[PDB]
Amino acid sequence: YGPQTAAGDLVFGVCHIYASFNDTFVHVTDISGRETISRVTGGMKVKADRDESSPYAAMLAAQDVAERCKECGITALHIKMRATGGTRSKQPGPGAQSALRALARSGMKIGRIEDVTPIPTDSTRRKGGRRGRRL
RNA sequence: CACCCAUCGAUCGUAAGUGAUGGGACUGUUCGGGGUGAAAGAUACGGGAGCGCCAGAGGUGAAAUUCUUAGAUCGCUGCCAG
């Protein structure tokens, strides 16, 4: 099933792409965000714990979410990319460009593109003491 | 310009320095995350409610302890606290 509109129109959902260093969410929802349509993570497409953030897992996840959002009736995506943000890291993880390419090549039209990494006007004490994650 | 009358007071008088690119005080005037009192704000971390969705999420060199179909993580809008 799907929505009904005139011939020359595009149904726009919003695709939140959560690209942290440990996983990768691809999350297609209604423009409100209130109604999830389909979300797939990089950990649903691989066996190893490592590959949850691999560029291949994010590709397969954004694929398998694009096919289902087409099944539902969504044709274009306003894209909202996100890193862990807050205090962790404002740099988007590896499986972000691969999710973008997956959606674009798969066939979803791409509207706006955005960065919604949570950032602080000022922040709570970051994890790891004064000396940080000594390695 | 030493005086002239109109019309306002008419205290009795400085004579032992000068006023440091010394100091202090004053006036004016910036300037500044200087101090302190009281409201308001901002996202973010966390929890919580409502609404979706379903199989993982978190974490790592790799894992595991940890959370999770009894609905975790994720998404949206209020809410609470620091």
Technique used: cryo-EM
Which residue pairs, CB below 8 angstroms and at least 24 apart, start in A126-134?
A126/A87, A126/A88, A127/A87, A127/A88
Q: Residue A45 CB closer than 7 angstroms to strand B?
A: no
Cα gap A58→A109, rounded to integer Å: 18
Q: Residue A52 CB closer than 7 angstroms to strand B?
A: yes
Q: Residue A13 CB closer than 7 angstroms to strand B?
A: no
Q: Which nucleotides of B are covered by protein (CB under 7 A)?
A: 41-46, 50-53, 55-64, 73-77, 82
Q: What are the Cα distances from residue A107, in Å, to A67, A94, A135?
A: 9, 22, 43
Distance from residue A98's CA to nucleotide B61's C1', rounded to whole Å: 24
End-to-end CA, chain A:
53
